[PDB]
Symmetry: C5
Subunit: 336 residues, 5 copies
């Protein structure tokens, strides 16, 4: 009962043209789309791109492939995929999208008596996600994913999500493979765009990203905090030890300078000030200000020692208090 299937396949192909869409000149082709994200890949800030692997599924109705037989379903493989007409779907923001070939071309194609068709297609999309690094690292990003049609305007092909929007897009629980982000949720929608040729249908999915802090705390914030504390120790050393206090001030200032260079090496070369830069700038003033206090004190330690000694003791208390007060404002404002 196998040769019976062979005759059915041969008959449908004969008299069938793959260069023409179903319902041409009679109606408008309607396509139902569903998605399942297997893994959300890493996000590269420098390249403003993210990698995503999905099992894209599409469905459309064709009246030219109707048949009757013992079975109502015809499981198949990539061999027959190119023999019939399929939509020229593309991703608008996809810089470079490539499919999978080995071990076998990941494709499927099924047909039913009523003309319903199914066409799954594994993909690996390296899309582009622009990001505004104004509140970095306390920033939230919305990386989109837009897919539609190239040569078929809305008057011919229209894409609509199957069933409700809740089940339209599915993300695996373990599919979040981000080392510096949290996948809060997803949103979907539809819209139209206008060009010279005509209107087109756009299906859009947005992923809400919440960055996870903790890597920069151990990398930039803590060294800056400890460096500031190191300089303040000089305030507890007697003035006559000019050389000893000089070493503390000079080393700390250079240490802060090199940290700023190192921090931005991996960060994108954005031409504006981020939140982290302001924190380093404030820490720079504290260490720099302490050095000035020593120089001013050392210059009047002879004529009027009383004022110099009074300032030194006062500095021990004022400086730590201001640093602690500033931190609460900085963290509370951003974490609220």
């Amino acid at each position: 009962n196998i040769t019976i299937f062979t005759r059915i396949l041969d008959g449908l192909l004969d008299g069938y043209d793959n260069r023409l869409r179903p319902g041409l000149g009679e109606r408008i082709t309607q396509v139902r789309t569903d998605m399942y994200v297997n893994s959300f890949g890493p996000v590269s800030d420098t390249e403003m791109e993210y990698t995503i692997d999905i099992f894209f599924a599409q469905t459309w109705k064709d009246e030219r492939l109707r048949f009757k037989g013992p079975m109502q379903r015809l499981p198949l493989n990539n061999l027959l995929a190119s023999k019939i007409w399929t939509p020229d779907t593309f991703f608008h923001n996809g810089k470079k999208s490539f499919a999978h070939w080995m071990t076998t071309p990941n494709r499927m194609l099924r047909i039913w008596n009523d003309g319903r068709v199914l066409y799954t297609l594994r993909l690996t999309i390296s899309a582009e996600c622009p990001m505004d690094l104004e509140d970095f690292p306390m920033d939230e990003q919305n990386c989109p994913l837009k897919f539609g049609s190239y040569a078929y305007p809305n008057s011919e092909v229209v894409y609509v999500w199957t069933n409700g929007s809740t089940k339209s897009v599915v993300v695996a629980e373990d599919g979040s493979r981000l080392n510096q982000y949290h996948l809060m949720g997803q949103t979907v929608g539809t819209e139209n765009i206008s060009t010279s040729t005509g209107e087109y249908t756009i299906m859009t999915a947005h992923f809400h990203l919440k960055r996870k802090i903790g890597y920069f705390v151990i990398q930039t914030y803590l060294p800056c905090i400890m460096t500031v504390i190191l300089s303040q120790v000089s305030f507890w050393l007697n003035r006559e030890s000019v050389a000893a206090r000089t070493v503390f001030g000079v080393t700390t200032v250079l240490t802060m300078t090199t940290l700023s260079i190192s921090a931005r090496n991996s960060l994108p070369k954005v031409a504006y000030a981020t939140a982290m830069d302001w924190f380093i700038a404030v820490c720079y003033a504290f260490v720099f200000s302490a050095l000035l206090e020593f120089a001013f004190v050392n210059y009047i330690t002879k004529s009027q020692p009383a004022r110099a000694a009074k300032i030194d003791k006062m500095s021990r208390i004022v400086f730590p208090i201001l640093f602690g007060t500033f931190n609460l404002v900085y963290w509370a404002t951003y974490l609220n």
Copy 2:
């Protein structure tokens, strides 16, 4: 006696459709799989991927290729591989899998009178291995390898290991080419998954990895240990040498700070504290604490020299003892 073989090949192809599986509508196709890992490639922690080269072998029974002749075996090459039906096997976790082309496409195909078939296929799979770096570097990882079918549910195609599981997967003795891991052993199993289309068969193989220590000992642990010892030398210097003791404390603190930055450059940017980070943090306190002791001593060396001198001598003994005691707890706990 060569043209006799030519007629046999031509006859089988005629009347044979490669788009339909054997036993369609009559039974369920059964596939027997065996593997031989030639080389386990390097594991990239940053990319969470590992490279593996295997000689994948598959076997299935087809009743449409039966023949009789002088020979019961028909050795062949890649030429006839695409002329018949082969399963659309794929790797679920394979990010990007590509076969080999030169010098000649590495493929084979053999047939027997009873319909038994053999299809070997060399492969180079760059799979993805998620890892939890909580006990790093004293961590054990289990990198999996899942392969199955794309368009053929369990009702049609089922994969089962040939013979026992012991001989199902073979790893060469010299095939372990890991510079920072040990290949302890392997495990295999089977499971099913459910999706919209239907149930599918999953064949899984797990590799147990035990990291080898010794690279980080010479890179991070030892410099931290020697840096701590350097600071303690200051306790054996007289107080009046304020400048000399200042150099020891400042240089050591900055040395520890830069080591932390350097260590995590190669390590993945995990947003949580590893075991190595805690060790560096403890070493940071020791050098930092020593600097505080000098500052406190230098501030009361005049009013009450007796207490300052007593503290200095006590510090020489307490500090080394605590560092030695802590090391035993750290190493014993992780190495046990």
Copy 3:
């Protein structure tokens, strides 16, 4: 009413040769071109290349595809693109240009009764943009984009912009994805070139680029400015503290030296002096000159203390004034 279209397509292909241009031996083929830049990619100074993604559109008239039927337009896909003749357009400066393949080959083809044709083609061009880094970073660049024909001289194929030049090239408002440049505007034009074979038509588009400053201010300029200020603090320290003033001078000089090396690491290895190099050179003299003043003062502080003390006080005022005066000339000259 679908099979009617099938007959039309078959008839046109028969008797139609794709190896010959329309109007061969009768007239000169005329092509109308329009462009829409979806995104202007990043500019790599080291590689002197920039990436651009466009939706290139072309139009030409052919008398061999005329037909009459219910519809005056025949939307199609990549299937029929290769079946007919299309110009062998190429980019002269394109080092490596590749099209898009997945999810479907991004191409379109439409025909009309009068013979008018449309052929859109998505592209990603990695062109080369030579740049003269003489006023870097205060520099303006004009990256061109030249496209024409390879084997068809001007006597056969001529390219002309459609409608006016204003609408010939369109750039999306959000298509400017440059992190270190501003897209001021665009210009277009036409020209001819002469070679051994004959004359050819050239269509050129130029993009005016204005670099955005602010990344180098936080990276190179500010550390140099703060480093100079650090050295001048030594002028407020008494001469007897020889060791203390030595630390300031030595550390600052080495700090400037390493900044110069770090700055040019990312910058292209141009064999001539840039504007930034001169700024660093001036800052080098200030810190170096201060060290010389201390050495000269320390060498005559005994024989004639009066002159040494007078010079030290004068240095406190002259040095800051000159640095401030120089900055106004440097910034005003370049920013004007």
Copy 4:
């Protein structure tokens, strides 16, 4: 006299099946192989791979292509290469081997009356060469190159070198393009391997590599030697200059620490001690030991100055002598 050749080619192809080896069921096919290495590419220690470009030549006898005519030789190109049967040769250790395509596919094929055939094939093999870095950099490596057959066991296809082994493999005098190795010589041999399918023939070629020293001398050895000499200068400074001697000891110790980190950055992350590591470890003790001597001397310079002064003078002589004595043992042992 050109059409005469055309008839000969057409006749041979008709009735000739490329899917069957010559002498099938009658004898065992014998293949003669010769090689000419155009250039031995660079060896990447990190990737344990080396690149080699060769002009591989193969020869086998087929009785199905016999002909008679004016010429006994038929020079041809890649066009006819795929029309006949060729062995499915492959490289066992080749991770990723690709041929050359432009300007024209580099292939050749010649036939003679007796059935002798020639098939040259340019190749670029990126093989894998495991190396044991125990005597690094005084190490000798033997990178192999194994090639055989995939689907044809020894009972069907056997590879044997043509003529003697001396002329079997040829390496160009200028083909050695190694910047850190010397190509001492080559060796060849044959062996069999056993698998599930059956026995296979293996043809192996080994290249003997002798590393050239001189890059590491200027990079690691000399800085370590000069750093040790710098510390010993402190022994010629009076004890009262506590600060001056402190700077020498601290700077040298940190300098050695950073050199160890820098040296292993390029070197593979081997989890065992190399010869170079031991040399750095010995140098670490010398500088570290000198610092301890100063601390111990400074702690008893008051109670018993005589012993402290005596030790200081003795250290000036003992330390340099031991360093010189150790170097002779280290270099002589490895260079002998």
Copy 5:
């Protein structure tokens, strides 16, 4: 008058075999070659490769494509390129050569009544240029470019430049895109090579390269010069300031050491001494020698102060003079 051309093309292909060269068994095919270098790409010292883009043109006479008609020329495209016989030209030293595909395959093909043919082919060749870095950076290099035939010996195919050698190779004025080299000129020639198969014709073109200095002056030479000057300032400081002079000597020595490591990071790991290395070695002695002078002076400043003071003053003059004298010899010898 278009169908007339169609008949001509069809007739020529019929009865024409592309697997046989023209004049087979009657004469020797002669090929005329001309080149036009559009852009000389960057030269990578580490990889010993350079990229070049050319418009290669070839010409040969075939008597099997003669025709008569209204036009004596048949402009065409890549469609007919593969339908006829073309030489299997290849580049001997080309590691990896690839052609251009988009927007259209860059190829052309023209035919004339007498049988003359033209075949242009755009190319991007990543050739290999061995270089001897003995006088680096004052070195001159001659990167060659060899092209010939693979399967056609001299007895069948011979390559000869068209017209004179002056016009044989053309380089655009703006085609020199080298950031660290000057394109002085070009030379061409012919030669034969002998192998097992037979003699072959070689066409060679050499490009003379003169490196441009100025990048290394700002990177390595100047920091070394300024570092030496910094150390000499210590000679103008009184002996009693032991700590101050110690800082100058130690910092300068370490600064020179790190510069040597940094300089060779980008430079190829050549296992022999370059000219730049000797310059750094001389600078190393000057700073190192100054430190020794201070140590020796400080050790005898009590017993015989007169000799120590006399040496210190003499050092101020001798050391600067020797450094200036050495520079003239170094620069004059290499720049002459």
